[PDB]
Design a protein around this nucleic acid. Sequence first.
RNA 1: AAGCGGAGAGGUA
DNA 2: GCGCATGCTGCTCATCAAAGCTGACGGCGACTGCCG
DNA 3: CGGCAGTCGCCGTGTACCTCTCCATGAGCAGCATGCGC
Lengths: 49, 98, 49, 49, 146, 97, 1123
Amino acid sequence: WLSAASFQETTRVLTDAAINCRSDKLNGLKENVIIGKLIPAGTGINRYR
Amino acid sequence: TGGLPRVQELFEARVPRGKAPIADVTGRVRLEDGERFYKITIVPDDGGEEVVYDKISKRQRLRVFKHEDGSERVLSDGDHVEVGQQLMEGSADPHEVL
Amino acid sequence: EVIAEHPVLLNRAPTLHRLGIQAFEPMLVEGKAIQLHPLVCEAFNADFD
Amino acid sequence: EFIPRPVKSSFREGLTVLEYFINTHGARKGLADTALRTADSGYLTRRLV
Amino acid sequence: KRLKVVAAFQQSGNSPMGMVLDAVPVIPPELRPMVQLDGGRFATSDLNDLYRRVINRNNRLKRLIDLGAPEIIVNNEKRMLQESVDALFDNGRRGRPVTGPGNRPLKSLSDLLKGKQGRFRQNLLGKRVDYSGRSVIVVGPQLKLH
Amino acid sequence: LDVNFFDELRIGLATAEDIRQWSYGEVKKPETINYRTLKPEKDGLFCEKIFGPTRDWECYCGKYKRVRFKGIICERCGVEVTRAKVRRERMGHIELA
Amino acid sequence: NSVPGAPNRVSFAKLREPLEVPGLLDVQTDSFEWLIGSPRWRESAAERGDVNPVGGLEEVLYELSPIEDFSGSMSLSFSDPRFDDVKAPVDECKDKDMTYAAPLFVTAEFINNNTGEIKSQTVFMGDFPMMTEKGTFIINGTERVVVSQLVRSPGVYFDETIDKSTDKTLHSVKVIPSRGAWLEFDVDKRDTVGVRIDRKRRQPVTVLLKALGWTSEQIVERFGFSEIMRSTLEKDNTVGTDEALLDIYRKLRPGEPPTKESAQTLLENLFFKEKRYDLARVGRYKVNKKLGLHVGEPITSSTLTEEDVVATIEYLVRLHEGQTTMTVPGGVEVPVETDDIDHFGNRRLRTVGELIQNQIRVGMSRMERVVRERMTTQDVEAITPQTLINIRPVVAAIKEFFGTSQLSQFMDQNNPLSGLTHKRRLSALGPGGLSRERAGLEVRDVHPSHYGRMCPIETPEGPNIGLIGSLSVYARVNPFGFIETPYRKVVDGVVSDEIVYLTADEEDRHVVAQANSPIDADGRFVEPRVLVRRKAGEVEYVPSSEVDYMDVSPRQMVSVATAMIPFLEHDDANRALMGANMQRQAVPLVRSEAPLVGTGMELRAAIDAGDVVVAEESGVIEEVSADYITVMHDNGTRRTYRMRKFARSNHGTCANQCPIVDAGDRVEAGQVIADGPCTDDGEMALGKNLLVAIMPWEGHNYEDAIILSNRLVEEDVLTSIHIEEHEIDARDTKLGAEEITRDIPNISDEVLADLDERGIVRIGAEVRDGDILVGKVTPKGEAREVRDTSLKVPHGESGKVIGIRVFSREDEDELPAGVNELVRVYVAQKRKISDGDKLAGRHGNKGVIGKILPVEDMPFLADGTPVDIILNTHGVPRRMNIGQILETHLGWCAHSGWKVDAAKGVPDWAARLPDELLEAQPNAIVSTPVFDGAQEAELQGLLSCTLPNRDGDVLVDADGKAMLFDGRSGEPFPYPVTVGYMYIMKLHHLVDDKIHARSTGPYSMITQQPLGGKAQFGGQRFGEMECWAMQAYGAAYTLQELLTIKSDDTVGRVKVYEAIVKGENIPEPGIPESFKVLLKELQSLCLNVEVLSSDGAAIELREGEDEDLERAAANLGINLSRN
RNA sequence: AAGCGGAGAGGUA
DNA sequence: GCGCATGCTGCTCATCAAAGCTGACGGCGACTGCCG
DNA sequence: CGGCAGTCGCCGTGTACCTCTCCATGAGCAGCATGCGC
Ligand SMILES: Nc1ccn([C@@H]2O[C@H](COP(=O)(O)CP(=O)(O)OP(=O)(O)O)[C@@H](O)[C@H]2O)c(=O)n1
Ligand SMILES: [Mg+2]
Ligand SMILES: [Mg+2]
Ligand SMILES: [Zn+2]
């Protein structure tokens, strides 16, 4: 829901997420950039760190 | 600038502006030209329900395709088509193609 | 001797593709304008006006 | 559309007054489209990304 | 269409009685500050006046209820209180947007998140940074490619 | 705090009990700031007893102005003696009629 | 010519001008003369009709009164506006930050009908701002300009549209008043004509026709020729006057008892009564001219009538049917056709007078309600005019217009041309106009009706392209607001000398020839076939037999800034537009010499701008100095002119004036006496003449860069003075009073040296970044508790101190409340040319200086003179601006001089050359008008007869090319190069105002990210697309470091700084503040957001008892560091 | 030991 | 000469205001009276 | 009942930088300051 909310139509996305009680696993590029940890691409994957 | 709208229409998967009907089955073409509306039935050679493509406004040409003779011909009466070939002129429909 | 072997990143907007940001080795010059190599003006799409 | 009357003189000889007037219709259109189609291009690029 | 929502409210452990409010949270003060003008008057903060209207209306309604006024007056007060809270949460959705000096609509809580100027697209995906500079560029035909 | 300990981020609806759990006090007056002493009003939208002290290790009246007296609460004003940044992390609530 | 002391600048022009250019600032002054009601306007208007010379304020006052109450026993009336003398001259107002205005009085009378007594007295109405002699206003010490607005005029507009499915024709009619409610008629999908009263729903027209008092048989008696009317009648089921009135009353007004009286009064008080509906003057004129109603009778009572509605219905029905001409009983014949909305016959202009008249109208309307209400609350026999009038609303409206508005704009004062062009500007935006984003593409285009009225070339190239324009040279403004142009009348094939001003409506009724036609010196065209402009703006080649008008001259379709470009018809439109825009950005230099080759427009564009001193009457100059000029008139009177020296401009440049007369010379009225910023002997001079070679050179002029010589720095060829102004205030506070003094807290006495005995710095002291200007000390707080808050010098600034201005409350000076002293310090500096500065030419050239070379390694001619500037040859051919090479050739010829050998006849190519143009002396000045100047045959002929240098040598051959040497190797170049002289100007984009760097400074408050901008130490934004680029590269640590410790991580910043200073390793980031603010906002919207761990147990994420040490001593950078 | 928000206008690539 | 009364003037506080305004346009879906 | 077609409302409409001006009122409610009368 974080990526979708930051793309477009924040109000509708947030209303649907609240009604459904969704949870976010935080395994993308946008979410990692937003919260402030390494993206899972390039020099940020486990085999390279 | 004139090309960008087409790309945006393709990527967004919308119904094309100048839609062109696509033949479903290979059959016997009968172009019953009307006053200002064309009509195609494509009688199924396999056997089934006649597919009546009607309400074709006189705004478009007919596809000059490689007919059974191996040369470029305009779709006329008594012609035989292939499964999934557009008849009129314009853009096809991605959903119908799928 | 404190700036030797320490690269810097140069950027010009809009950043339409990847090569809009690039890393160079700095050298001190007299004046107030940045000097740019002739061959990297097509990636940035920059001209001097 | 095309104006039936052509421009029969080059910029080396020099255009006349109304030849120079009817030639300004074509530059304004380019200058205005350049500033109005970039938004469409950028929006499409953001959606693609 | 109805099942899309009824199933969502059934499957999970949540209850539908969250659409009706009995208390209203207040954002911490550091996030809605007041700025002094040339050592003179203040500049207002939008968020500090919607809360003010809500609390004033609530106090008036409470005083009217405690006094035993006719039910019609208290109903009118309740209607106005609900409209005030609606204006606080999302302004302009229903009716005339609440305006201030110069008949300019005020900024509600929902406008801190939506749009090209909201927090999502203006403060989280891009930022301002230290150790940065800017200047005009000229040509040096003597540098190496690096 | 380290980002490596985050595993999920959940969202949902909030009931009245949650809202009263978050809050540190109820605001019951529209007043925000005083014009004479330039200090937050009592029980207003900027009250210090609810949201926190304005100045580090200071009370509201006169009592505590030193670090070594931290933790305890003034018996006259009730404002906690602590750092001034807590004013950007605390919430109150309004009790509708 | 026609100017008493103008220099001699011979011209290449072949034609003759029947008319001279008008005053270029009258568009601004005529409106204000009309509004005020001054005698000069009264006489001018009386000349062309003395029917009713109604002023601008008196018309508002007469349309306001009389004011009566419900009963009708009391009345109040205003009249006789009158202005007193101005409070103070303009210089004092600009010095003290006060508005320049005059008091305004009226006469108000109150009469009660019951008894009969009348009480009349004068009433004060506030201070009215007054316009100066240049057309600018001085509000709060700032110079401002009010710009004209292009609007759509009120009237009746017909429109046609094509159906999407049925492919039919749908017609519409729209009635647009000045103030009131709109009504629109239309034909819908089927044959049913509908009317949408005030844009709500759609009722058949028959309902309205019946409701206005028409029987069910009269419609057939009058509209009995169309079938759509029959269809509309058939499905009506209303057949009733009162029924229709009730239906309309219920449809318009929702939720009220539809009483018949109310129904029959609302309509009569919506489109017919002069209280809520107006078709001001112009609207009635256009309505009467469209439908062909009564014409000739003076217009009065401008309100919509029933005849207009019936005529509109008839017109719409005929247009839909397909007829071409219609006539209504009692009217003249008129054609039936849809009309265009961009035609300059439909768009009108609001000038300054009307713009301020509207605001005065609003203010008086607001005051009227208060005056009318005060009558029913107090007692009679004590009501006097001074007890019903409060002037607060009027002053509020005036002060809210002149300041804080989108049409009164901060003046542009780069140079005289920019200021002269800021006025003479037509703007489509504004309140009641268009929008900058949702504008379109058909309103931003050039229309064939702009010929002679609005320049097609000059316009912005940003998001305002096509929405802002400039008036043409000869155009003026109609009383209604329509632009006019002069034409010369031709009868029976002979071109007369009578000039008539026509507007687009009339210009579409005749055939107008071209300006440059072959007149046979006797009034007849050389060749019958001529290009003419027909009705619809099309140009056609027709025999010279039916023409009836001609253009007054070429250059009649261009503005004033576009008429200063020589060889304009050789450039493409884009580069010409760029050059016209860039001519208004040049900075004044210290010498300001005039162009060698130019047009004839410079002399008039400087006298009418207003930056020079011109003698008012003839006399003998008695004394001249650098401060004043004393002229002794011929009738024993004497007059002294003062001069402004080193005065700062709105944009930080320098404004100077210098006398150019001797101690015994005799002057004449209108002659120039002193120079100005960018003027040289009366002519506008924006640049300098430089010797140019065109060639690529070692790659230092690659991609529009420029190579410059070192003689332009040694000899101050391109140098300018820039001034800056600083301010500080000593205001009161609760703990005490702030005072500027010398006893600062503990700071070295080495820095208290320049400050004089009582604070402020000394005049003449040189200051650098970080120095103290005025020393102020403020009470700190629990005496001796004080803090240092003195005024410093910002980063990267320097220069001398020119003047100091100190105001005080002790000597009774006008200052705001709570401030005892105000000090302003002026700092000036000289500025030489350097790498990064921007140069340009008149033909769209533009570039930055890439290198500055020593004199001894530049290409030099045979006699040893180095060139001054080198321009690359790869930018000329593909941009289509070859006026610059023509200018180069002609400039070389003008510099060197020529002499045509005509001992045995005159050469065939020099037949058309005017005499006195067959010979020139070195350093001559010539003129090339915009659309008739030097031909290439004449230039090629002049290039072949040029005088030699001091030796018998000719440096440039018949092609305009020279042989150069190489300054570094000495070997001559292998081929000849093009050399000449060009006019170069210095733009106001200097690299000293553009360099910026930061490592640590102030931060924000809600989010802790760095501030933005140069004014405060600000960081550079790392946008979204740069994040995309970083993610595409694969750099996962650079991005994380950029987004956490360099922007938002409040605890990582100090640790990073300490690690860097102490040489250890950079630590790991944390959690930024922006995410926390986002979570707080989401919770505040009544959403339960939580951060969970690997096994539930949501993380606290609320700080804690962590290390709170402050090492490194020095503040991270938010502020500076004290000794 | 101490402040930095909104509205409008005009420009550069 | 002193007391009383009347008129400039500083300080202070409210949100329910509406007559003014009117030159954006394509895509997509709910929905609502309205005909049949 | 059954469709049905229009109509209305909400969503979106490129990036980075520089310079300038202005920011709620009216009316009420004391608080004196001056003139007049005994
Ligand atoms: N609104 C705008 C206007 C300009 N720009 C940027 O400035 C440049 C304009 O080039 P330009 O047209 O001035 C010359 P160029 O493009 O190099 O072609 P040429 O060499 O053949 O003459 C573009 O590259 C844009 O990236 C922008 O981002 N948004
Ligand atoms: Mg280029
Ligand atoms: Mg460029
Ligand atoms: Zn206390």
